[PDB]
């Protein structure tokens, strides 16, 4: 059988690659981590270096504090019993304040206060991480596409935990921290708003989520199919189109009557993906603030 380039047959290794300098403060990069031969069958073997820096420390600290606030609450719910902790791990939940507290921070620790504290740490962790996606691109002289794409994910997260609850006038509207409880919240949210299948922004979000899997399967397969002509060296194919890019384009042209370019497919990609959470966040933000029941809204079309 022909080799299909899903796993590599032979790995090679040279000196640890310390990366491009550009305007990066090298004093903030770690040393390299271990090389993983296991990872190396599918992707790069090299781990690290990673960029630290003070904003990075803030994100990591704040993110760890979020995780540990939830975890300590879980231990408390477990009665500090390790066996119970593991047994009931997916059932524990850190829940927002009751509706009576509105948007106040006056809720007692065990009744919403600790959720507010965990949420504050999460807010700092995510936004300081966003700053990092921007600044690491800036230091390398790169465009800011990653930061812009990340902002679309942040939009849905912000709508769910912050913007919508504020507009609704209570933290009780926000998502609990727990494995099963967040799934329960999601089901309940749909039931209470008259079935999200009737929310056209939910339908669109689904089209883009399915469409992201369609497009990445198409693009991943295409690049592998032309990897025998160096297709995955996409930047140099953009700069100097080769037979890889031409055969990729013509496969699609002959199949469905139109095609992309090596650069342009990545614009289809970024937009297909970001539209998942852009449309999703709109759909959720409108729910309960403007539309109480999507079935009813859809009967009026408006």
């Amino acid at each position: 059988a022909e080799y299909q380039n899903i796993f590599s047959q032979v790995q090679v290794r040279g000196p640890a690659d310390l990366g491009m300098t550009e305007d990066v403060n090298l004093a903030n990069r770690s040393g390299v981590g271990p090389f993983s031969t296991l990872l190396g069958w599918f992707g790069n073997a090299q781990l690290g270096p990673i960029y630290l820096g003070s904003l990075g420390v803030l994100s990591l600290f704040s993110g760890l504090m979020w995780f540990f606030t939830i975890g300590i609450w879980f231990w408390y719910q477990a009665g500090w019993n390790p066996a119970v902790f593991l047994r009931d791990l997916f059932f524990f939940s850190l829940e927002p304040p009751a509706p009576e507290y509105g948007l106040s921070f006056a809720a007692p620790l065990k009744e919403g206060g600790l959720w507010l504290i965990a949420s504050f740490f999460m807010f700092v962790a995510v936004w300081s991480w966003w700053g990092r996606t921007y600044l690491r691109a800036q230091a390398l002289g790169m465009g800011k596409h990653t930061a812009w794409a990340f902002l679309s994910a942040i939009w849905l997260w912000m709508v769910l935990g912050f913007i919508r609850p504020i507009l609704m006038g209570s933290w009780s509207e926000a998502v609990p921290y727990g494995i099963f409880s967040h799934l329960d919240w999601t089901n309940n949210f749909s039931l209470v708003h008259g079935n999200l299948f009737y929310n056209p922004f939910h339908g669109l979000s689904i089209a883009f989520l399915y469409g992201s899997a369609l497009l990445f399967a198409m693009h991943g397969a295409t690049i592998l199919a032309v990897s025998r002509f160096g297709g995955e060296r996409e930047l140099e194919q953009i700069a100097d189109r080769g037979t890889a890019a031409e055969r990729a384009a013509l496969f699609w042209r002959w199949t469905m009557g139109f095609n992309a370019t090596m650069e342009g497919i990545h614009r289809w990609a970024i937009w297909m993906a970001v539209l998942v959470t852009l449309t999703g966040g709109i759909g959720i933000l409108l729910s309960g603030t403007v539309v109480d029941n999507w079935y009813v809204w859809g009967q009026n079309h408006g």
Partner: protein, 240 residues
């Protein structure tokens, strides 16, 4: 209501985005042509976008697209029908002439460079201290073609330095010259490397590289094209 306004606005945005994406994707290969290379009458409803310019590193200049399209190489095919839409028959040996699935593009006759301006791809013997780190080391193995005859022996691996990966096997032929084989077109086995794409008598015809320690984008395209072309054109010499 606000939701109706939002959804209406979204569909208008989406139509505009699709128009943007489709036109961005017309920066290569357009205007469409007739089979004789002249501009086609029907270009479709999307116009070409305003040109953009990529600044290339290491003094290599710029690329501006869209721009005048030309193959910049002879194409040895001829019509097989009196109207549009039929295949074009090779006028010579399609493997030698580089057409059909043996096609290459007239890319720049210079090597791809890494971020430090060094040659991206080097023979492993010239790449300090690159080495095989896992899997069967193919160096020293006999190379077998789809006629099940031995065509040569592997004498090195050509490696992508910045990406740390095997990109070609360098194979020495009976006459002592060597050729590069795309890593994606070989099967490394315990006792041999097998190349389904080529029968042993076609190895000599693999395009050669002008300098023995680097490979240009043009040369890579000729080599990769020729090897892949063998799946169709060596099918007679293959071989259950």
């Amino acid at each position: 209501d606000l939701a109706s306004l939002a959804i209406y606005s979204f569909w208008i945005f989406l139509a505009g985005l699709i128009y943007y994406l489709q036109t961005e994707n017309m920066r290569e290969g357009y205007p469409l042509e007739n089979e004789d290379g002249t501009p086609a009458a029907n270009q479709g409803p999307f116009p070409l976008p305003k040109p953009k310019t990529f600044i290339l590193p290491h003094g290599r200049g710029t690329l501006t697209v869209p721009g005048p399209e030309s193959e910049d190489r002879p194409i040895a095919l001829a019509r097989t029908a009196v109207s549009e839409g039929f295949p074009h028959a090779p006028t010579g040996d399609p493997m030698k002439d580089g057409v059909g699935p043996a096609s290459w593009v007239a890319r720049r006759d210079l090597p791809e460079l890494d971020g430090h301006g060094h040659n991206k791809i080097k023979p492993m013997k010239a790449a300090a201290g690159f080495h095989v780190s896992a899997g069967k080391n193919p160096i020293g193995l006999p190379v077998r073609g789809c006629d099940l005859e031995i065509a040569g022996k592997v004498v090195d691996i050509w490696v992508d330095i910045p990406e740390q990966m095997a990109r070609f096997l360098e194979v020495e032929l009976k006459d002592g010259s060597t050729r590069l084989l795309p890593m994606q077109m070989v099967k490394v086995q315990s006792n041999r490397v097998h190349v389904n794409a080529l029968s042993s008598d076609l190895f000599a015809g693999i395009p050669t590289i002008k300098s023995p320690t680097e490979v240009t984008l043009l040369e890579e395209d000729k080599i990769c094209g020729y090897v892949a072309g063998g799946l169709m054109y060596a099918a007679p010499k293959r071989k259950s």
